[PDB]
Amino acid sequence: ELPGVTEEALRLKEAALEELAAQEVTAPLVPLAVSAFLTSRKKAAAAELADWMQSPEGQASSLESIGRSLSRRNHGRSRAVVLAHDHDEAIKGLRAVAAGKQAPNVFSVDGPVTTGPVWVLAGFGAQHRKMGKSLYLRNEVFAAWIEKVDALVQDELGYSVLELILDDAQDYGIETTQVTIFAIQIALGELLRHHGAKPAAVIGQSLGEAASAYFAGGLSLRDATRAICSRSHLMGEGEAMLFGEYIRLMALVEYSADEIREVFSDFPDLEVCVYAAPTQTVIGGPPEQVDAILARAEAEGKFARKFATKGASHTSQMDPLLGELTAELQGIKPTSPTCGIFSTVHEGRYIKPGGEPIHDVEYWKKGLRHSVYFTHGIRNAVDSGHTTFLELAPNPVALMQVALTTADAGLHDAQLIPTLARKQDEVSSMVSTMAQLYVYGHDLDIRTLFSRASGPQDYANIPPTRF
Amino acid sequence: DKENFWGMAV
């Protein structure tokens, strides 16, 4: 007994499948994998493979069948991927790989990365109107998850996130932004798991906390959704009844914690919401104060962005909500994580897989009320040897902040891997994301990025390697 | 600062 897809969603869906069948058809992005024990030899295979693709027999093979065949080869420690829509992009890419040159559509490394990937679940500031729609229409696993979450948020809040996603006329509010990003993050991460990927550790930021508790194995899907639903409605309601003198704003400014100590003397009502990067902090407070701080900063040519909200989460101003939040989470069952956690709620500190559960009711209270230790959890992950950070987001705003912490910590070559992007094709983005995982040697079954062969023309006679 | 077609700082 659990809600089905509503009729309005089915109706919006058919309007959406025809808006889409009307559209001018386009070439899919196809990943071409090339690997060997040694780079030297990987380079040789690419150049050969590009010669063959330039040949008539190679020209008569669809990019798909060539990719399918490549994915069945035995994959070695030295690896490359070329990401192509047509033969000419492919060959150009492979030429770049063969010459150890650099190309946007190409990734190539000498051997695997040493530690597993950190999944970054953030979300704040990432929402945009049509987020998730294209990938829902075009991918059946993503859609299945988006629906399983839709069904649960229906049970919890009484409306449908699927209908928000499908409807070009609907923009997002405080509340619906949080549950929609949650939906999107759950079904992204499960799309990755479907293809063999898995997080070594998670780190959450704020709204992302709940999806990150689920990917960590700390809450069931039901409990995690209780966690996103309970806080989001409460902040949306709360924010609604705020006007003028009680209103507090949130803005991101290019000052560090300290630089802000030397403002927050002068401006005493100000509070720190998120420690975002070593030189970026999200603050919240009285709008005369916030505008002041912005005005100072912008004058010094320091980055600044005011956010759309009349209330400031992670501050004393959430105290009215906390008794209610507590009561709404009566009965959630926190479990022992199945992967590492850098907790930005608990000051950036790390919790080991098989540790004592952290996601109790009090976690969500402390999370909503206190600062978010985001730069700290990231500087932690780096100090412990992680270099791959992959963001599940509809637009990777958190990953840029990650860039700033990694560099400030002496890591100048992170694999910073994003998922979805505003104004970028959603299928293609995920193809890339999985192609970067493959390349860096992280878990990712590349076979699964192709449909099962229905006949011989589904393979290609790509150059052989054994004898 | 930007992310491109395939997930790079651009």
Side-chain angles (χ1 to χ4, degrees), chain A residues 29 85 104-105 107 396 418 432 436, chain B residues 4-9:
Chain A
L29 189 74
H85 300 94
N105 67 308
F107 295 97
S432 309
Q436 269 161 103
Chain B
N4 84 18
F5 219 128
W6 354 75
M8 27 238 15

Short mmCIF file of all heavy atoms in Angstrom, two decimals, chain A residues 29 85 104-105 107 396 418 432 436, chain B residues 1-9, unseen atoms left out:
data_model
loop_
_atom_site.label_atom_id
_atom_site.label_comp_id
_atom_site.label_asym_id
_atom_site.label_seq_id
_atom_site.Cartn_x
_atom_site.Cartn_y
_atom_site.Cartn_z
N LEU A 29 25.99 10.72 -27.24
CA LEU A 29 27.42 10.72 -26.89
C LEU A 29 27.81 9.30 -26.58
O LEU A 29 27.15 8.66 -25.79
CB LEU A 29 27.69 11.58 -25.69
CG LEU A 29 29.16 11.84 -25.36
CD1 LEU A 29 29.83 12.84 -26.35
CD2 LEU A 29 29.24 12.35 -23.99
N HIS A 85 30.32 12.01 -30.64
CA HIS A 85 29.00 11.89 -31.30
C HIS A 85 29.11 11.29 -32.70
O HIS A 85 28.17 10.68 -33.21
CB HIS A 85 28.34 13.24 -31.47
CG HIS A 85 28.10 13.99 -30.20
ND1 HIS A 85 28.99 14.91 -29.70
CD2 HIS A 85 27.02 14.03 -29.38
CE1 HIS A 85 28.50 15.45 -28.60
NE2 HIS A 85 27.29 14.95 -28.39
N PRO A 104 39.13 18.32 -24.46
CA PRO A 104 37.90 18.35 -23.65
C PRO A 104 37.19 17.01 -23.67
O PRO A 104 36.85 16.49 -22.60
CB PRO A 104 37.05 19.43 -24.34
CG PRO A 104 38.03 20.36 -24.96
CD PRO A 104 39.09 19.36 -25.51
N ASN A 105 36.98 16.43 -24.86
CA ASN A 105 36.26 15.14 -24.90
C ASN A 105 37.13 13.93 -24.58
O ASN A 105 36.75 12.81 -24.89
CB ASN A 105 35.50 14.94 -26.22
CG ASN A 105 36.45 14.80 -27.41
OD1 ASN A 105 37.33 15.66 -27.60
ND2 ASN A 105 36.32 13.69 -28.20
N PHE A 107 39.73 11.76 -21.66
CA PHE A 107 40.32 11.56 -20.37
C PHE A 107 41.22 10.37 -20.52
O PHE A 107 40.86 9.40 -21.18
CB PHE A 107 39.21 11.20 -19.37
CG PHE A 107 38.23 12.28 -19.15
CD1 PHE A 107 37.06 12.28 -19.83
CD2 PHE A 107 38.53 13.33 -18.30
CE1 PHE A 107 36.15 13.34 -19.65
CE2 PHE A 107 37.64 14.38 -18.11
CZ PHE A 107 36.44 14.39 -18.78
N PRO A 396 26.50 21.68 -10.72
CA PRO A 396 27.55 21.41 -9.70
C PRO A 396 28.13 22.69 -9.11
O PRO A 396 29.32 23.01 -9.35
CB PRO A 396 28.62 20.71 -10.50
CG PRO A 396 28.51 21.37 -11.91
CD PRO A 396 26.99 21.36 -12.08
N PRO A 418 31.45 16.16 -12.09
CA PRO A 418 30.06 16.55 -11.89
C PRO A 418 28.99 15.63 -12.57
O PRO A 418 29.28 14.68 -13.32
CB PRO A 418 29.98 17.86 -12.69
CG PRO A 418 30.95 17.66 -13.76
CD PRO A 418 32.05 16.81 -13.28
N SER A 432 29.51 10.99 -19.53
CA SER A 432 30.80 11.51 -19.11
C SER A 432 31.15 11.13 -17.69
O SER A 432 32.30 10.77 -17.41
CB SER A 432 30.85 13.02 -19.18
OG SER A 432 30.41 13.50 -20.44
N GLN A 436 34.52 9.18 -16.66
CA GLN A 436 35.56 9.58 -15.77
C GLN A 436 35.78 8.54 -14.64
O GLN A 436 36.92 8.09 -14.39
CB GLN A 436 35.22 10.94 -15.21
CG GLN A 436 35.78 12.11 -16.03
CD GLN A 436 35.09 13.45 -15.76
OE1 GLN A 436 35.63 14.35 -15.03
NE2 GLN A 436 33.85 13.61 -16.35
N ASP B 1 32.76 30.52 -12.31
CA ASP B 1 33.62 29.76 -13.30
C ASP B 1 32.84 28.51 -13.85
O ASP B 1 31.92 28.03 -13.18
CB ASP B 1 34.93 29.32 -12.64
N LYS B 2 33.16 27.99 -15.05
CA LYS B 2 32.24 27.00 -15.69
C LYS B 2 32.59 25.46 -15.76
O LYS B 2 33.74 25.01 -15.59
CB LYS B 2 31.74 27.52 -17.08
N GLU B 3 31.54 24.66 -15.98
CA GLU B 3 31.72 23.25 -16.21
C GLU B 3 31.20 23.07 -17.68
O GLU B 3 30.16 23.63 -18.06
CB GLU B 3 30.96 22.37 -15.20
CG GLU B 3 31.83 21.68 -14.15
CD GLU B 3 31.83 22.38 -12.81
N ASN B 4 31.93 22.30 -18.51
CA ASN B 4 31.55 22.06 -19.92
C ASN B 4 30.84 20.71 -20.30
O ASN B 4 30.59 19.88 -19.44
CB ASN B 4 32.74 22.35 -20.90
CG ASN B 4 33.76 21.17 -21.09
OD1 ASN B 4 33.50 20.01 -20.79
ND2 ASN B 4 34.94 21.50 -21.62
N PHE B 5 30.49 20.56 -21.58
CA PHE B 5 29.90 19.33 -22.15
C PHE B 5 30.15 17.97 -21.42
O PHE B 5 29.34 17.02 -21.52
CB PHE B 5 30.61 19.26 -23.51
CG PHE B 5 29.77 18.81 -24.66
CD1 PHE B 5 29.73 19.60 -25.82
CD2 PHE B 5 29.06 17.60 -24.62
CE1 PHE B 5 28.95 19.21 -26.92
CE2 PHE B 5 28.29 17.19 -25.69
CZ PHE B 5 28.22 17.99 -26.85
N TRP B 6 31.31 17.84 -20.75
CA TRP B 6 31.79 16.53 -20.27
C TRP B 6 32.29 16.55 -18.84
O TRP B 6 32.84 15.55 -18.37
CB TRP B 6 32.89 15.95 -21.16
CG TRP B 6 33.14 16.73 -22.37
CD1 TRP B 6 33.79 17.91 -22.43
CD2 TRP B 6 32.73 16.43 -23.71
NE1 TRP B 6 33.80 18.39 -23.72
CE2 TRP B 6 33.17 17.49 -24.53
CE3 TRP B 6 32.05 15.39 -24.29
CZ2 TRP B 6 32.95 17.52 -25.89
CZ3 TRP B 6 31.82 15.43 -25.65
CH2 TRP B 6 32.26 16.48 -26.43
N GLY B 7 32.10 17.66 -18.15
CA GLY B 7 32.54 17.73 -16.77
C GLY B 7 33.95 18.22 -16.52
O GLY B 7 34.68 17.62 -15.72
N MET B 8 34.34 19.31 -17.19
CA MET B 8 35.62 19.95 -16.87
C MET B 8 35.47 21.39 -16.47
O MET B 8 34.58 22.07 -16.99
CB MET B 8 36.61 19.86 -18.03
CG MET B 8 35.98 19.75 -19.36
SD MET B 8 36.56 18.25 -20.14
CE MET B 8 37.28 17.43 -18.70
N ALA B 9 36.32 21.84 -15.55
CA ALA B 9 36.48 23.28 -15.27
C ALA B 9 36.95 23.91 -16.60
O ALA B 9 37.96 23.49 -17.17
CB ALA B 9 37.47 23.52 -14.16
#
